[PDB]
Amino acid sequence: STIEEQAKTFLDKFNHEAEDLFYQSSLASWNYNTNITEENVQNMNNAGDKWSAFLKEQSTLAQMYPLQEIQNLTVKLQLQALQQNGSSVLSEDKSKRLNTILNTMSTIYSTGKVCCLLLEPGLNEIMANSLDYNERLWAWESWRSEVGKQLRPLYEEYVVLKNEMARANHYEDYGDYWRGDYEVNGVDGYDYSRGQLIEDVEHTFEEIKPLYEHLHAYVRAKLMNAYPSYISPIGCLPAHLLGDMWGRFWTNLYSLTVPFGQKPNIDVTDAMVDQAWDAQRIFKEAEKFFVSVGLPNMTQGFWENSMLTDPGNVQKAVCHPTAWDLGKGDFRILMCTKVTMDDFLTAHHEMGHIQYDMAYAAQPFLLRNGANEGFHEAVGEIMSLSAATPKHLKSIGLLSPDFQEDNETEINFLLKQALTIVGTLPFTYMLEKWRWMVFKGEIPKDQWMKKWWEMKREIVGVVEPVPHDETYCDPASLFHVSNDYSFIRYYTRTLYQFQFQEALCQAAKHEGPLHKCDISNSTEAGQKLFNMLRLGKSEPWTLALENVVGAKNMNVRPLLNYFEPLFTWLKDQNKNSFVGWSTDWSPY
Template identity: 30%
Template sequence: MNANKGATVLHLILIAFYTRYACADDHFKMGVNTNAAEAMQFLREYDREASGMCYRVTLSQWKFVTNITEHNRRRMAEELALSSKFERLSWRKAAAFDVSRVPDPQARRQLMKIVQSSRAALPEDKFTELQQLISEMKEIYNSAKICPFGQKPYDPHVPKVGYLGAEKQEDDRNYPGHQQYKLTNQPYQHYQPYQDNAEYPNYCDMQLDPEITRILAHSRIESELLYVWKSFRDQTGPKLKNSFMRYVQLTNQAAVDTGFRDAGEQMRAAYEDPSFRASAEEVYNQVAPLYKQLHAHVRRRLLQRYSSHGLRADGPIPAHLLGNMWAQNWKSIMDLVMPFPSSPSLDVTSEMLRQGFTPLRMFQMAEEFYTSMGLKALPPEFWRASLLARPQRAGVQCTASAWDFCNRIDYRIKQCTEVSMQDLVSTHHEMAHIQYYLHYAEQPQLFRDGANPAFHEAVANAATLSVYNAPHLQRLGLYNNKSHDQYEVSMNFLMAMALEKVAYLPFAFMVDQWRWSVFEDGVQDMNARWWQMKLRYQGVIPPIPRTEADFDPGSKYHIISDQEYVKYFLATVLEFQIFEQMCRAAGHAGHLHECDVHRSRDAGRLLSEIMQAGSSKPASEIIRTMTRGKTNRISPEAIVKYFRPLELWLRVQNREEPVVGWNSNADDVKLFAPLRAAAISRTASAILLIVCIANQLLL
């Protein structure tokens, strides 16, 4: 082959690859039906039938989670099965139309939503298998239990063991119907065995929430942290790995049959951005310097507490030391990293209790927050049907959630509210979701959603940024700081927020980076790739060696339950962007973290504009309107601005650090043992494929 001919062939290959990858986000398989009138009639019928189906499914789910019985479980399963059949039938009808021949742009948008977001292109047996596979993985995950630290698995021939200082109570936030244990007197104390043959039949009964989560948050015993970190992964990942591999096969097949390259591309289609991956990476790169400053400060403080447990002054942080099962939220280690320990954190729980707050009063306060901005009052059905406090009966799943029953009348919140600062913020958050439902209620069923998958959470969190700050709490009469330095209080507040928001960003970014790589490149070395990405983006390593026999991504519920995750990364950035625009509309001048939009009609109008369109317009149009034409993209400028006072403080604290960020060495990489031979083999295969294509072109 001469050089010119070889260059031409390579050029053709690159053009082919570019065309395939650049255009794929705008492409899916179209049908042959060009009858526009028939398409419009189908959409009218779909809107009516889909709303009815949504109502029945949602009602059955509500009945189950608020009254967990086997009867309600069966009824819910029946409705979900009918919903799956309706989804498949609707997909076939929508896929039969040639969308390009439908003149109405809103109708085209609705048809594309039906076709692009479904896995119904699979044959019926595989579609059913996929649904069952996801359900089975959820059940395995939710049933994961471990023994208390220092105890052996249950043996029926030895006396049973209970928990010292523990009282039994119902706590069903994530695991319905399960007896759980709440430690008394102190937020955390070490589990110790005691003999009791009657009350506790099986002491190996610790689940993720609340027991394991509480230990990771409050224990400072490194060996105990390591034990629960490893034990939970042992009870999830290996049991889920084979099912997940089959899930990857089926979702990829569904995506290809719909017209996408793989399931990752199908997930990304909802963002309507042909360069979505590059856009998300750009956002991450702009927030990475702030994260690295936080990482360096936290590493230094952890070194002071855990000086002999795998930490280096310039290295990554072992994952089990960060107060969270996945090292995604570091707020629980605030006591170790607080800038000014002698100044208080911003927590008004005690004042709320002193003033006699009740759950009902907290919800009324949240409603007033939104109506003061000119937003909608809640309908009577909300107050009549919502579950706002823990009921006396057993069998209630208490995870806070907002519900839209798809009939433009019935909206509810389910929350076992306790009088606390945390639940006050949660109440405003869930109420923001209800406001979103109310504002896009007049849209067709297919458009009753956020502008893209990140918008609902972003709007809800943007509103709570105004609730969770000193000026707003002072206005409510819940906070009065006269005895402490305001700068120190502000730094403590910003540190707490950074441990929750900034620390979360690289994790939320890398989860789907990993998932997309599995969809693209296959299931080989899945665990090694997971830790490679955690090291690259989070600066986190496993505390003990991991192999491909482990499946650590399986310890994250969103992965095995088929829930995309990049939306949480974008929502965290977008919430600050929305909040900044609301503050600008309210005329706020000063630090962004001190802005309160309560009672600002102008801020309310801006928020209303964002919510009313639902998903009837691309997110880029909503952002352009929101920013008054400044940009049409999600921008990290606002989150960087919000934390700028803390970043300046961190830069001063980190000036003696050998590295702001982290250096990794061979020992770090050996912990997850990447298979170099396999990587070389994949590279060789890719080269061989290019050579084969080139040879074919030359023939």
């Protein structure tokens, strides 16, 4: 008989075991998530450890199956996932050392003190609000100067062992390791090798850039009301001033930078509080919304088995909006949901992940995942964005006919989004590209911070208010470094969200800028999306993006058609000062 028969039977003997043992781990973890106490810990641990030891054994057995003879592809794709050695390719001493480096630098970032203040809330809530150059500069500098002190020496040794596992896993760098997931291979036309992810991302970053250059120049010109003595009209923006301690979001500057601030944003939480919707009503409205999209109803056990409301002090449990899939058809949500429109839209956000985890559940275990790391998050938000629009909120009835939308309201709306989104894509590509340079080694370990504060000016337009050196690291002082995360997800999530938006709005026959697009009652837009959710990682994302959008490669023009009137008024308002920014200034 064939190896394909041999591989089929092995993977069948995997799948039926994997779905059971993974469930047992996942149920214990839900119980711990439901009851953050001991014994729940140990039961969660033991089951997850034994699941890992099963998964490592199966991966070790999968090595004896010669991949090239399989023509089924789907068997091949499960093998191509299972056979990945990961960290176990390292020498055990290097595996143990990197494991220690990971655990330690993660713990420092989880525990670092600025003197004293912890990172959360102490520094975050200062930098969102201080508006004092002296406090902000201290709170910025000391984070590098007291905790960056500790993360940088460990990051220098993390990079090499990560590159060593990348090399031994036949990646070109440990950036390519994360780039590996976007790879499409072995397909005519749809193929998309690991390095192809450097292209298009830089091609679209250079394309979104003008909208951010006009935002930065408007924000700078507007924020000089707040920081007249501290900001140059021509220079970059000082990294301490910008509403965050890293500056990765300007969203806190919104309250100062609204051009038409005498026109409040749209909200209907007051009518929902008036009508005393009880969170369970909100998930009921979320179901009726999905039903209005044509997505199926909640399953019976979900309603009691999930946690849809704050348990109170009588049941100790950390809680945040969290789609839960356990397998065996066990779907749940955990959220301490409360009576707001943002709990409502985050209920929609998590329910999108519930739908994606359900639709590809028809696939085998390893293929029960999104077609790429960013597609899962894009799907999450697109059912939030579709429901956020005032047109839908009028269909919700909670929006009065009084104070319908207008340009003055919607520019205020889009501005905060831009300070939340198009301000972050520079920072996202910045770190991911600088990480590509570190893991490739374009810059030795002493150049890292010097190249950083060059590219921060080219990419983000942000500058060191006081200089820092090899005793410091602004990158390693942030989660996605200190916790070893693929960060490009944020960049790709954003573009897929608006790419899917334009495709769904075209199906909805939307009119004008995409801010007033609504997908409810346009059932075809939901079914056109659902047929992509059904595939997940079983089929290339370069095909699923063709199925939804038709774009066989990444496109950013739909985002510019979402921000379209904001970009118009940025250009119109920018001539309040210099347009864009220059690299050649910092406060000192």
